[PDB]
């Protein structure tokens, strides 16, 4: 089997992307944030505290003929941005882009933090990291990908995120029309439960490539590119008037600037992030200070190749016995 679903930016900045997901029978379609940095499929639901729901579409298990309470199971998750959610668990039929999994754990939120409530466009998360990170207790649950894997034509999924445009998540096949040149594959460590890999270096604009190992994770659920402070300082030093602002929460730069590109290495290959992708717009409506899309990973404890990086590439998440990542230009 295969599946193919379009993923759409939630707003004009590409802050996150939502993908429609069918849950239950008859189908209830919710727009979920596919997150290769976490491993829980959780939804706003009929169980979510009413004051914490503001415009989201909810899953109502009582209206699904295929929903079963997973008796005794609970979940609770905290993300890197300080947001959180928790609740109980159902199993139900879940379909993405025509690919169906029966018996998928659907984590029903009883509580969500303010950042989730305030984002009316995101009805929940679909985790695509390794199932070792799944928070369901006392019986850990599998991701949608892990449950689908055996049925797929090839044990893979691909992320093809758009810049200010829709893109695609495919499951079970690699669309050879969706990228240019060849795909460069690189090793993955699953030791922390992430799609963790090592970039071979970077360049700023038209500058020389610096060969240096940068461990990090491929994380579709993180907006920006978080890299070591040395790398980030070298990038922003090429932008007139850029500075790190402790008041704002990272590097800012004059909205009048033209940003340089940023290149990262994948083996001997290179992915170029256009400068435009690194613009996250005014720090507040009408401001002439703009927020940067490349930020320091200092204090996060990991480097994160978030959407700013991933959207510059066609990305293969190869879930074979020995996982690998692949990157191609597009």
From Swiss-Prot:
* UniProt superkingdom: Eukaryota
List the keywords (alphabetical).
Answer: Aspartyl protease, Disulfide bond, Hydrolase, Protease, Signal, Zymogen
E.C. no: 3.4.23.22
Covalent S-S links between cysteines: 255-290
Positions of the catalytic residues: 35, 199
Q: Name the Gene Ontology biological process terms.
A: proteolysis
Q: Does the keyword Zinc apply?
A: no
State any single GO MF term: aspartic-type endopeptidase activity
Q: Which residues form the Peptidase A1 domain?
A: 17-328
Q: Which reaction does it catalyse?
A: Hydrolysis of proteins with specificity similar to that of pepsin A, prefers hydrophobic residues at P1 and P1', but does not cleave 14-Ala-|-Leu-15 in the B chain of insulin or Z-Glu-Tyr. Clots milk
Q: Tell me the protein family, please.
A: Belongs to the peptidase A1 family.
- Protein name (Swiss-Prot/TrEMBL): Endothiapepsin
Query: Origin organism of this chain?
Result: Cryphonectria parasitica (Chestnut blight fungus)
Q: Which gene encodes it?
A: EAPA
| Portion of the full-length sequence here | 90 to 419 of 419
